[PDB]
């Protein structure tokens, strides 16, 4: 692994574990046993570290939420989209925790995150659109589906934060809450299985 | 106004405007034109300021969410509960922004916030329970209602945070998203008005 990749890997670990608030470039250099100057060669400041870490998260989520258009959406796809996004949110937990300071610190990050959020929302719309086509949920108007998609986002991205105030694999039980959003829209064909599936995620 | 009350009022203003992360007791003393020693008399450290500010927010929300039991719940009550909680979340915006560091800094705050969250959730259950009794929504099982109540909480407390990433009275349009949760459970009697009401909050 190249020195640079260690820097990104270790920074992520320290940010997730101690909070980005409390981690400086000197801490990161000390952890990695490289001089401050060595770290500076690869990254001029902490914001540049954070931006590149975000760019890896962005690439990951885009890859998971690249919806296939040549086949119908299955329940196994639904569980994959949900689990993989929840795993992402755990692996990059430092980001959503200090989100608002990170956006304010970096206009590039703010711009990219706004655009990323629209892609994610557009993938949630698209998943529901396909679930309708497959006969899993009842098809809904353009407005009520945009609203419902935002609620999915709001629930998923605030689950970690709720767990810290209520008290790894403890984390995925937020799927139960997301599936609760689509409980009354389930068609007769699938009501039995989707509820059965939902139950397997209960805290 | 007593010197102490100014300290709490001004600390809230500086925390909301600049972020608690970036505000120290010296900044607060400087803003108020009182010596560091004068501030120390009233508050030994920043955590004590924050705890007391939280205790005022807690009292406020408890007062708004003290559900009357001697009459049925109306739609006007529903809008009040929603608007007042959203106004609270704006007025104390600094708290939810740095929530996780604030809980970690103070075990008293962590304990009280966990308990406060249960009271709030228990008021959401109770509001739905009363909406069922009034014939506004369809009555739901104990489990599906606990789940739905948590989704309300998850949506409300993450609305501010979404607005910073998507781009005062701009803030209350999250009511549309909360009411979207109860759209399919509306009874024939009230479907017309609750949707009509929901529309008045559209961004």
User: Distances from the Cα of B187 to the Cαs of A104, A184, B145, in angstroms?
Assistant: 44, 14, 16
Nearest by CB to B100, from A150, A159, A161: name it: A161
Task: From chain B, pick out residues whose CB is under 8 angstroms from the CB of A97.
Answer: 100
Nearest by CB to B183, from A100, A144, A166: name it: A144
Strands (E) across B117-170 are located at none
CATH 3.40.50.1950 fits A2-203, yes or no: no
Domain limits of chain B?
2-203
For an interface test with A, which of B139, B154, B155 has the most A Cβ atoms less than 10 Å from its Cβ?
B154
Structure resolution in Å?
2.5
Can you tell me the distance from the alpha carbon of A47 to that of A31, in angstroms, rounded to the nearest whole number? 18
| Shortest Cα–Cα distance, B45 to chain A (Å) | 19
> Which candidate, A163, A114, A188, places its Cα nearest to that of B99?
A163
Task: From chain B, pick out residues whose CB is under 8 angstroms from the CB of A103.
Answer: 164-165
What does the block give as tokens for A24? 């400086």
Task: From chain A, pick out residues whose CB is under 8 angstroms from the CB of B110.
Answer: 165
User: Distances from the Cα of B43 to the Cαs of B48, B109, B118, in angstroms?
Assistant: 6, 16, 29
Please count the other Cβ atoms lying within 10 Å of the Cβ belonging to residue B41: 12
Phi-psi group of B33: left, alpha or beta (phi > 0 → left; psi -120 to 50 → alpha; rest → beta): left
> Which candidate, B106, B16, B20, B100, places its Cα nearest to that of B55?
B106
The HSE-up count of residue B188 (CA atoms within 13 Å, CB side) is 0
Can you tell me the distance from the alpha carbon of A116 to that of A18, in angstroms, rounded to the nearest whole number? 26
For an interface test with B, which of A54, A112, A142, A180 has the most B Cβ atoms less than 10 Å from its Cβ?
A180
Method of elucidation = X-ray
Please count the other Cβ atoms lying within 10 Å of the Cβ belonging to residue B2: 8
Task: From chain B, pick out residues whose CB is under 8 angstroms from the CB of A166.
Answer: 114, 117
- DSSP code of residue B69: S
DSSP H helical ranges for chain A: 3-18, 25-32, 36-42, 46-64, 75-91, 93-97, 99-105, 107-133, 142-157, 159-166, 174-182, 191-199
A130 and A67 Cβ atoms separated by less than 8 Å? yes
Task: From chain B, pick out residues whose CB is under 8 angstroms from the CB of A156.
Answer: none
Question: Reduced to 3 states, what is the DSSP secondary structure of residue B186?
Answer: strand
User: Phi and psi for B10 in degrees, rounded to 5?
Assistant: -65, -40
Can you tell me the distance from the alpha carbon of A158 to that of B163, in angstroms, rounded to the nearest whole number? 14
Can you tell me the distance from the alpha carbon of B180 to that of A144, in angstroms, rounded to the nearest whole number? 8
Q: Name the interface residues of A facing B (CB cutoff 8 Å).
A: 19, 21, 97, 99-101, 103, 110, 113-114, 117, 144, 147-148, 150-151, 153-155, 157-159, 161-162, 164-167, 176-177, 180-181, 183-185
Can you tell me the distance from the alpha carbon of B94 to that of B76, in angstroms, rounded to the nearest whole number? 29
């Amino acid at each position: 692994m190249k020195t640079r990749d260690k820097i990104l890997l270790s920074s992520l670990e320290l940010f997730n574990d101690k909070g980005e608030r409390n981690i400086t470039t000197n801490h990161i250099a000390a952890h990695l046993a490289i001089s401050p100057g060595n770290l500076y060669y690869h990254f001029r400041n902490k914001s540049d570290i954070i931006y590149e870490i975000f760019q890896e998260y962005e690439k990951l989520v885009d890859y998971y939420l690249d919806i296939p258009e040549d086949r119908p959406i299955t329940l196994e796809d639904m569980t994959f989209y949900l689990e993989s996004v929840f795993d992402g949110l755990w692996s990059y937990r430092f980001f959503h925790r200090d989100l608002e300071y990170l956006l304010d610190s970096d206009p590039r990050l703010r711009q990219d995150y706004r655009e990323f959020t629209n892609r994610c929302l557009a993938a949630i719309n698209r998943i529901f659109a396909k679930l309708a086509d497959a006969g899993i949920i009842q098809p809904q108007p353009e407005d009520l589906r945009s609203a419902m998609s935002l609620n999915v986002w709001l629930v998923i991205t605030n689950w970690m934060a709720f767990l810290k105030t209520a008290h790894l694999t403890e984390l995925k039980q937020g799927i139960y809450q997301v599936l609760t959003l689509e409980v009354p829209y389930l068609t007769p064909e699938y009501r039995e299985r989707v509820l059965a599936l939902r139950e397997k995620y209960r805290p």
